[PDB]
């Protein structure tokens, strides 16, 4: 109900200027390392939505906020309650580079969790969808770089989860495969589940999303639909890119105003 | 407090999962890497004869007091240790690697050290398979009236599938017991008698050596040639010690798992 | 002189339907595996050039023809003679994920080969170019995915080789870093060395290149400058994408005409 | 035919390269992984006492005929083997991995197994460093009049930097000598006498045991407590055998390198 209960989320993995833990420590388990936050007091609602874009600058990581919602990192402070959500997108990951195409389908479809009769019903569509015909009986280390991504999208789409989270590709593919790919992602938009999309392509996120966050160093600077935020996000970049008033004279100050934005 | 029911129900719901991707790593490492395959009987058979050549030549006579025990006593025991030296270590480091490629899926992580042990279980069914071909040249032909060891085979499964939770879950949080069990698997060649006869000692230090449960299973596989068709009741005072140290490891292994299950992602 | 002596290049890594070599073999070293070519009789000239794009479909791999020219794969038949060429681009590769930013600069700048006084002269510009300031004394496994690519471009640009080869990024970066990145690649265009660029972005390769190949399953179908080839390449795709006459009825035949294109 | 000049000139042009990224893997594996560091003296000191406890208790008396040799005889020799068991194996598999991340650069690949050996050379300068602290409790205090072993230390460099070309270049083309040297490093605990006294045998099989060049260096480090300040001339008939098997390995290692140097990319 309302599709996220995101409230006051903070996350910190802290700074170690020297080698790893117990670098100077005693029987007392406390260490001496510098503090660093990554998220600070995030609270929003998704009200069953359709789709939310996430933009900004990747100094704010932006994948941290994603896989929190995927339920695979623990937040330091705050509670999040959704549903039977997705493991986000298993593109180009989990594919062992020693097994053939028949084999690695049985890897990842079992890793996502499907019964032994479901993997035979789901079998011949995937080979039909990837179009790598003779190479399906040959291990992945022989494939080119555009064929792993061709294959890895084909398995990790037939998921039927509740809450999707997409990384910054959305059509990784090739020319004349992205047309199959974008039409496949129109099914999730048609079905009406929630999709959290992350990109830097402003043209795609205008063409695909309805609501949109905007994150800056853990701080949610504004959250509306699309119509005012992204041009104000473009107002920030055109301010920043032009001179932004002498990037040593003010942007060094700006980061120090934003390093002051690590705290009160 | 019974949290171990939650672990054991996961292995019931995924028994096809634990078998189907068991042999993939067997296909990944033993095959699709090199030339002519199955070094894993070629390598230990060279590796057995080295330990006989130095230790049979201190025990040239003075063999165990049956008429048969020789090398016959030795390689009947050395089947077990090959499923320990390269099955406790790689089970421990199974969760150091590949969590990035597992946590992005949805299936219980408790099964993740348990299949790689069973991937090394098929090492037996080629190595322990070729010991009968040796043991068809004994004075007995096969001793079909007693080769009954599925129960003693099931101990090696039950011990190692339980012990690789204290050394897999607690491995990732500290990354130092990996260095410990890299030596603790070393000391379990000599703390247990794979090599000599432990009857060089009175009934205190001799009896306080089988606190190690691993010595019990070695008495099983060495009784694959004896004829003791009721090998429980002659040592029933501590065959229940074996089935209580496995249930202690399995409960304590479950407790250390679920108190850390959703946290090993920054390791 | 003429910047490549590419002539009649063929390359084959052959098909193994079962497990690896000596799968059925005897003391005679011959094996029983199915033949598969990847390049067939390639011959062209680059006449000091400026830049050559490479397009097509990634069923033809397209990286094979690149790193042949980088001199790191041996061709089966044919000779190629250039110069003191480049190792192509070391983006996102060679970075050990256990060492800090000060350390991995000393990795890759030594891996490419520079003296101990050159790495201190080249030092503070790279930190100035990457803008990851506090994280420069922290190992790479703490970085986000857009910061490794931020860093990995910064080292593997100051190379001064003779013949560059670019993979399919050309500005991997981020928004408001790609503007620094594209201006850095304008130096190589200004200096006049040869650059072999590979992409699927038709808009970038029109905006950046002067000559262009077009490769199809190892067969060089046409090679001119830009002006006729890419629209004819777009004529092929718009033919292919629309229906291409019932993709089971003719495109299954088309691949079989092109599997017949593995041979006479 | 002298192609080995081309290999040796590459190590001259990259002597800063071979040192500066030597200690990075030392920084990569020993540090930045876990808690409190340098297990690599904590691990072998546990690992030494296991081999004494089983072998000193067969040689309780009957020690080497000097007044001192004991454990003193043993751990003075066991310094060498720790730089063999985990320095021949990881040198061999150094070119299986990381060629994808090396061939995309431009620097000679002959140096690529040679620094990872020297990365394990600093294992000595913490382990052999802490043997003097033990050896300041001998009847001699240090024997400053003879601890002269830089020459005998340089043999371990020269042997292993040469031998890890026949087992690194020829490793990648077949991927099976990795399984061979995984056992051949095992047989070189007992083919050479790190443990017993080889004077249990007449002058044929005893003399035909030092064909292994590794036994010569063990005679060096055991002579770190003797006083033989001219230990060449008493065994000069085969100390030139040592310096001819290293030049045979280095020439044959170069020949197998350059006949395959531009081909191991599909392996």
Author numbering:
A (entry chain A), C (entry chain B): 2 to 265
B (entry chain D), D (entry chain C): 1 to 267
Verbatim from the authors:
The wall teichoic acid (WTA) is a major cell wall component of Gram-positive bacteria, such as methicillin-resistant Staphylococcus aureus (MRSA), a common cause of fatal clinical infections in humans. Thus, the indispensable ABC transporter TarGH, which flips WTA from cytoplasm to extracellular space, becomes a promising target of anti-MRSA drugs. In S. aureus, ABC transporter TarGH is indispensable for the transmembrane flipping of WTA precursor, an N-acetylglucosamine (GlcNAc)-modified ribitol-phosphate (RboP) polymer covalently linked to the UND-PP moiety, out of the cell membrane.
